[PDB]
């Protein structure tokens, strides 16, 4: 039958065993993909010293990815953009990358669960059929409030490359963006 | 040592201009001891005038290349000043690689917001986003020596006699030694539209690129080259040129275009030479840039042509 990712079987780097006892359920809910032939999938986590409502308010802005991601020269949306599911964005990337542009579709925008899902539907790049989900999770550590972001993706392995190659590259970009999100979110919270 | 040079710096098919360059003639008074010692009797000889040439191929943005254009030669002069207030053949080579290494590392740290920058006190602030960087290829030319310092895949090539001699070696991640250095530092190199550090950056060394420290380092390769009566020209250029044209052919074309200009136009009055571009060098730089575009280079293209002959008679 169809095959599925199993990111719930391992604690991602940067999460505690206690945190994962809660987050494990969220991996099943939001970060499980049906795998197609010759695809690659990864789950990344990032702790943020900010309340989950602050992190989500940043993450949810599908029209402004440059506020919490690297590599973007410019991003445009529709003239009548309303942030409905099915919105698209056209992104121009900075120079020097193995990619120049990206066209992306907003597939999940769940303000009730704080989950954002996007599918790459075009552009000049080598991550064909990339789909990703980021989910935001709040914790109260005896007065101390923090957030863990979970971000996963599934993508085709491009011809000429291995799954190890593809995960190394995609993980690197996702991790770097998650580190910008930390900086942007923590700088809005004393 | 009258500086003879010409330059072209074009954006070409790219949506942004991220190449920069700097030419500063008569910029430095290099202590004669950094170039040579005494030998049997020139007491007047206390320094030689040094001419500065630099090409900076930016990536991820323009601000690092622009900063190198505005700052790097002043950081070099500051390094040399520290040696004049603190004062061997093999020693000279080591001294120059120390001077240029310190200069390149100072600029890199200023860019990253980790070294303070002069404020008309010093301010710690990144010049550009952490994903912005630049190559740097720099040449110091005086009557006796050429010093080249390179970080990245822009290139300086000396034409001596009939042989093109690269004075830099491209810092690409698949270079055997650079590949080993990156992996030894804990990094990874992936073939992903060419050899790239973590699949992202197609360069093993650069100025800037804070996010890929300490895999992508600013330490340059430095070449201390005695000059020779056989020297013809020195070419500094970004890979917008070298990606479509061969080292030998570029040098030979520059020489032939310089000679063609002189054959048709004679030489300028020597009172006018060294003030601005040399028309023969400019004709060579112009021609090389138009050939690069004709050959389909779709990149920014920046070229400095330097004539190393005192005179050209037929
Ligand atoms: C599609 C794509 C491929 C590629 O190789 N790179 C370097 C990218 C860099 C950035 C982006 S973007 O910021 O527009 N979308 C966010 C994003 C980040 C990372 C992966 C997919 C989408 C997209 C890409
Ligand atoms: Cl472009
Ligand atoms: Cl920039
Ligand atoms: Cl020719
Ligand atoms: Cl000519
Ligand atoms: Mn460039
Ligand atoms: Mn650096
Ligand atoms: Mn190239
Ligand atoms: Mn280039």
Numbering used by the authors:
A (entry chain A): 20 to 209
B (entry chain B): 186 to 225, 227 to 273, 278 to 310, 314 to 507
What do the study's own words say?
Enhanced ABA levels elicited in response to drought are perceived by the PYR/PYL/RCAR family of ABA receptors and the clade A subfamily of protein phosphatases type 2C (PP2Cs), which act as necessary ABA co-receptors in ternary complexes. In the resting state, PYLR/PYL/RCAR receptors display an open ABA binding cavity flanked by two highly conserved loops, named as gate/CL2/β3-β4 loop and latch/CL3/β5-β6 loop. Specifically, both gate and latch loops define a surface that enables the receptor to dock into the PP2C active site. The formation of receptor-ABA-phosphatase complexes causes the dissociation of different PP2C-SnRK2 complexes and abolishes PP2C-mediated inhibition of the SnRK2s, triggering ABA response.
The comparison of CsPYL1 and CsPYL5m binding pockets reveals that CsPYL15m displays a closer interaction with SB at mutated Leu112, whose methyl groups show favorable contacts with the SB’s aromatic bicyclic ring (middle and right). In addition, an enlargement of the binding pocket at Ile137 is observed (right). This free space is filled with water molecules that interact with the polar side chain of Lys88, which is otherwise buried in a more hydrophobic environment in the WT receptor bound to SB (right). Thus, Lys88 of CsPYL15m is more amenable to polar interactions in the pocket of CsPYL15m bound to SB. Recently, opabactin has been described as a powerful ABA agonist and a key feature for its enhanced interaction with ABA receptors in the presence of a carboxylate group that interacts with a conserved Lys residue in the ABA binding pocket. Both CsPYL1-SB-HAB1 and CsPYL15m-SB-HAB1 complexes lack such interaction of the agonist with the conserved Lys88 residue of the receptor; rather, the structures show that the hydrophobic CH2 of the SB linker faces a water-filled cavity harboring the side-chain NH3+ of Lys88 (middle and right).
